Amino acid sequence: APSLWKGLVGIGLFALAHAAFSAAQHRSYMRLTEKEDESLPIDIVLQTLLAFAVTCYGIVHIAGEFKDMDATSELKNKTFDTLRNHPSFYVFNHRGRVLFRPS
Amino acid sequence: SLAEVVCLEMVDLPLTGAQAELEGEFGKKADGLLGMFLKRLSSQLILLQA
């Protein structure tokens, strides 16, 4: 799922860049002709707004963690069996050691 | 015959080929959204070829 969102964001960014290039070409043509104070066509403006909204949707979905405020639910499935043993004090005197000695 | 000058003026050049081509390509009288999109695609293809 995240890969699809990343691809959609990339496609939206590419569409935005293409709309930018089209607007730049429009302004370059406008500089050619005297007067004719007209705005850029509305179709490209709608396309760039569509690219603005599409990339704005996946940018929220990419980084969603929203971890729970309560910390009692994170030590909830953990049992006391694993907590009893500690990495610090570790005695290497067990029957399994001499059981596994020969293979 | 270029010593005594009475009146003088300056004029500009007509146009440039690529600039004139762009000006002609942009010229639209009455068209729909599909037509402008097709014209934009054609212009992009021409730019890619260039």
From Swiss-Prot, chain A:
Residue numbers on the Cytoplasmic membrane side: 1-2, 63-103
The entry's keywords: Endoplasmic reticulum, Endosome, Golgi apparatus, Magnesium, Membrane, Phosphoprotein, Transmembrane, Transmembrane helix, Transport
Main location group: endoplasmic reticulum
Lumenal topology ranges: 22-42
Membrane-spanning segments: 3-21, 43-62
Membrane topology, record value: Multi-pass membrane protein
Protein's cellular compartments: Endoplasmic reticulum membrane; Golgi apparatus membrane; Early endosome membrane
Family: Belongs to the membrane magnesium transporter (TC 1.A.67) family.
Its job: Part of the endoplasmic reticulum membrane protein complex (EMC) that enables the energy-independent insertion into endoplasmic reticulum membranes of newly synthesized membrane proteins. Preferentially accommodates proteins with transmembrane domains that are weakly hydrophobic or contain destabilizing features such as charged and aromatic residues. Involved in the cotranslational insertion of multi-pass membrane proteins in which stop-transfer membrane-anchor sequences become ER membrane spanning helices.
Subunit structure: Component of the ER membrane protein complex (EMC).
This protein's name: ER membrane protein complex subunit 5
Whole-protein residues included: 2 to 104 of 131
Curated annotation (Swiss-Prot), chain B:
Residues of the full protein shown: 448 to 497 of 993
Coiled-coil residue spans: none
Job of this protein: Part of the endoplasmic reticulum membrane protein complex (EMC) that enables the energy-independent insertion into endoplasmic reticulum membranes of newly synthesized membrane proteins. Preferentially accommodates proteins with transmembrane domains that are weakly hydrophobic or contain destabilizing features such as charged and aromatic residues. Involved in the cotranslational insertion of multi-pass membrane proteins in which stop-transfer membrane-anchor sequences become ER membrane spanning helices.
Protein name per UniProt: ER membrane protein complex subunit 1
Family: Belongs to the EMC1 family.
Subcellular location: Endoplasmic reticulum membrane
Organism: Homo sapiens
Self-association state and partner proteins as the record states: Component of the ER membrane protein complex (EMC).
Reported disease: Cerebellar atrophy, visual impairment, and psychomotor retardation: An autosomal recessive, neurodegenerative disorder characterized by developmental delay, intellectual disability, hypotonia, scoliosis, cerebellar atrophy, and variable dysmorphic features.
